[PDB]
């Protein structure tokens, strides 16, 4: 049914299959060292595979992204025990900055590195803790990432489709079906991840580190390019400064292509602004306008079926401070309000 997912999943799998530093058996030893709080051991383990003589000249994006993944788990780990990795591992920061340059991404691990670029097998999957709850946390993102990426493409495509066309309702229906994967992610997370273990055992690994004289956030599903999708769909012309600062916070952490999608649509009417202007001009007597707006309302419905339960998941974990993305759960309440207001516009048009 979700035929667009496969190409995105295949692009991730290429990085997941890559082990340019031959580090697989080494990174598997990291969870034991974290459990023992063995900081010298963690450093010594990293230095067994950390390149010292620069990056191999044959490397492309895939090899450099894979290398950042493997070094990356050591970054959150070191910071988790109270140490700036750049300060306790000499020669590390030049390597991180070279890998940032090679990938056009930040100089540390991101969500992409620890989830979809990370192999799934028990004898290969990299992990901070090796805990079952961390395994399910990674899985919860793998459920929806490729489907979200397809949904971004569908949103960009829908932007150029007239509400007067039967194509509008059909593309919106298709978009809704990809966005349902976000809901599936949260259901999975609510069922399989203990909030207690998350807060006590996992969360400490997601603190910011300093590289290149600035601070970079640790991995979080907050880094998924959902905010780019909604920037195009409804948010691009919002004047809420807090919402704007939220989006611009994560921009460095998403694929270059999605930064470029974000830039293309900024300061310009969002999809629903255009769609509603068109509905106003043409009238809801037009059958394709009615169907298009109805299909559009269902898109907001699924966003809200993600966002509202996700808020409860987050509050439950913090019932045991701010996330890895740097916000308290109250920001989530604000984004949720914005989403209801956007759905409200669509439904008043009907
Ligand atoms: C134990 C599990 C989780 C907790 C405790 C949690 C908590 C949070 C927190 C505190 C934020 C605010 C930003 C920050 O400071 O990090 C956030 C944002 C966000 N998270 Fe999660 N989260 C969890 C799982 C997930 C999952 C499984 C997904 C999707 C697969 C997800 C997707 C998002 C998105 C898209 C945002 C941006 C805000 C929004 O779009 O509503 N999170 N989360
Ligand atoms: N940003 C949220 C949840 C979170 C941190 N790391 C994550 C990862 Cl690696 C996957 C999914 C969610 C999270 C928090 O820091 O509590
Ligand atoms: C959720 N990060």
UniProtKB/Swiss-Prot annotation:
Molecular function (GO) terms for this protein are: heme binding; metal ion binding; oxidoreductase activity
Q: What keyword terms does UniProt attach to this protein?
A: Antibiotic biosynthesis, Heme, Iron, Metal-binding, Oxidoreductase
The UniProt record gives the binding positions of substrate as 219-222, 318, 324
Name under which the protein is recorded = Monodechloroaminopyrrolnitrin synthase PrnB
Record family assignment: Belongs to the PrnB family.
Which Pfam family is one of this chain's hits?
A: PrnB
Gene Ontology process terms (BP): antibiotic biosynthetic process; L-tryptophan catabolic process to kynurenine
What InterPro entries does the record tag this protein with? PrnB, Trp/Indoleamine_2_3_dOase-like
SUPFAM superfamilies with a match to the protein in the record: Indolic compounds 2,3-dioxygenase-like
Q: Which domain of life is it from?
A: Bacteria
Q: Enumerate the cofactors the protein uses.
A: heme b
Its Enzyme Commission number(s) read 1.14.19.-
The function of this protein is: Involved in the biosynthesis of the antifungal antibiotic pyrrolnitrin. Catalyzes the ring rearrangement and decarboxylation to convert 7-chloro-L-tryptophan (7-CLT) to monodechloroaminopyrrolnitrin (MDA). It can also use 7-chloro-D-tryptophan, but 7-chloro-L-tryptophan is the preferred natural enantiomer.
Q: Which reaction does it catalyse?
A: 7-chloro-L-tryptophan + AH2 + O2 = monodechloroaminopyrrolnitrin + A + CO2 + 2 H2O
Outline the subunit composition: Monomer.
Heme: present as a keyword of the record?
Answer: yes
Gene that encodes the chain: prnB
The protein's annotated pathway:
Antibiotic biosynthesis
Positions binding heme in this chain are: 310
According to the record, what happens upon gene knockout? Cells lacking this gene lose the ability to produce pyrrolnitrin.
The answer on whether this UniProt entry bears the keyword Cytoplasm reads no
């Amino acid at each position: 049914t979700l035929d667009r997912v496969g190409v995105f999943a295949a692009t991730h799998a290429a990085v997941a299959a890559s082990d340019p530093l031959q580090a697989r058996a080494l990174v598997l030893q990291l969870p034991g060292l974290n459990r023992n709080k063995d900081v010298p051991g963690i450093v010594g383990l990293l230095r067994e595979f950390l390149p010292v003589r620069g990056l191999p000249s044959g490397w492309g994006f895939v090899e450099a992204a894979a290398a950042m993944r493997d070094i990356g788990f050591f970054l959150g780990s070191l910071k988790r025990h109270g140490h700036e990795p750049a300060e306790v591992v000499p020669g590390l920061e030049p390597v991180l900055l070279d890998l940032a340059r090679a990938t056009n991404l930040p100089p540390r691990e991101t969500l992409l590195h620890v989830t979809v670029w990370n192999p799934t097998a028990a004898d290969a999957q990299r992990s901070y803790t090796g805990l079952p709850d961390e395994a399910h946390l990674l899985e919860s993102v793998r459920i929806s990432m490729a489907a979200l990426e397809a949904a971004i493409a569908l949103t960009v495509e829908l932007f150029d489709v007239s509400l007067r066309s039967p194509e509008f309702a059909q593309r919106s229906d298709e978009l809704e079906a990809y966005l349902q994967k976000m809901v599936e992610s949260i259901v999975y997370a609510y069922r399989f991840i203990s909030p207690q273990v998350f807060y006590d055992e996992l969360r400490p690994f997601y603190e910011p580190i300093r590289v290149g004289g600035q601070s970079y956030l640790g991995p979080g599903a907050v880094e998924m390019p959902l905010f780019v999708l909604e920037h195009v769909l409804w948010g691009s012309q919002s004047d809420d400064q807090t919402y704007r600062e939220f989006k611009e916070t994560y921009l460095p952490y998403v694929l270059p292509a999605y930064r470029a999608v974000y830039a293309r649509f900024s300061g310009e009417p969002a999809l629903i602004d255009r769609a509603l202007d068109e509905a106003r001009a043409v009238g809801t007597r037009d059958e394709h306008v009615r169907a298009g707006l109805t299909a559009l309302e269902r898109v907001f419905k699924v966003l809200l079926r993600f966002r509202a339960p996700h808020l409860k998941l987050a509050e439950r974990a913090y019932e045991v401070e701010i996330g890895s993305g740097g916000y308290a759960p109250s920001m989530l309440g604000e984004l949720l309000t914005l989403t209801y207001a956007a759905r409200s516009r669509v439904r008043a048009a009907l």
